[PDB]
């Protein structure tokens, strides 16, 4: 509910909304247009009152209405959870290290078990993982250290 | 390369020797990786302004053996 930013003294008629459209609205469609709705058979766009109505009306907001008339602030989120290269993801949580101890590690999605400690490798800057001759994960670079 | 999108670029800068295209081994290191995901069938180059280059090759899926240095770099590779 936003009754502070959309309400001041002496009223406010800033917002607009359309009760009159030629048809229904297709999914995710914007129809910003000022076309007077036809009534009967008149092509009237000069007549303003009867049988020729403006397509959009106002959302005149004041600090004193009922709850059903308050200027609610609505934000809708649409996601695309399909087979596609992921771009936006959640806040993955990081933790401590605790070296020289058997610890379950989940390094940047590489999950396993073992004991981790300092090394004297020669990792190149682009390098992220480590392995051996038999292709088993040997060394991992700390993503936050 | 554009394998499953995920555009790949690798670069390496060598000051070269008296010749132009050498034989001495030179590894190629990645720089960036981002999901382009668009059709890529044509390729063109851009030039500069001024008042023996652009050697272009193509890749095929082959099997390779690479000798990894003790430091982790690449010292010699052999085609199969």
């Amino acid at each position: 509910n936003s009754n502070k930013l959309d309400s001041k003294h002496s009223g406010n008629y800033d917002y607009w909304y359309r009760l009159f459209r030629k048809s229904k609205l297709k999914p995710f469609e914007r129809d910003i247009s000022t076309e007077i709705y036809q009534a009967g058979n008149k092509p009237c766009k000069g007549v303003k009152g009867p049988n020729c109505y403006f397509p959009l009306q106002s959302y005149g907001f004041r600090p004193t209405y009922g709850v059903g008339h308050q200027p609610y602030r609505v934000v809708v989120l649409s996601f695309e959870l399909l087979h596609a290269p992921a771009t936006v993801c959640g806040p993955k949580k990081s933790t401590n290290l605790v070296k020289n101890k058997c610890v379950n590690f989940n390094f940047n999605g590489l999950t396993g078990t073992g004991v981790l400690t300092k090394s004297n490798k020669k990792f190149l800057p682009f390098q992220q993982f480590g392995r051996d001759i038999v292709d088993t994960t040997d060394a991992v670079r700390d993503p936050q250290t | 390369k554009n394998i499953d999108g995920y555009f790949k670029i690798y670069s390496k800068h060598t000051p070269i020797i008296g010749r132009d295209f050498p034989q001495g081994f030179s590894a190629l290191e990645p720089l960036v990786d981002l999901p382009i995901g668009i059709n890529i069938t044509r390729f063109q180059t851009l030039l500069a302004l001024n008042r023996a280059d652009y050697y272009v090759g193509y890749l095929q899926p082959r099997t390779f053996l690479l000798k990894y240095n003790e430091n982790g770099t690449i010292t010699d590779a052999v085609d199969c």
Binding site: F126, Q127 | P22, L28, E29, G57, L66, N69, E70
Partner: peptide, 24 residues
């Protein structure tokens, strides 16, 4: 303009397939 000369690539054009450290 440009030329269409053909040369031999010799041994050249080898990149790291992955980012996994390997030694010896």
């Amino acid at each position: 303009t440009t030329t269409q000369s053909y040369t031999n690539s010799f041994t050249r054009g080898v990149y790291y397939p992955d980012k996994v450290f390997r030694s010896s």
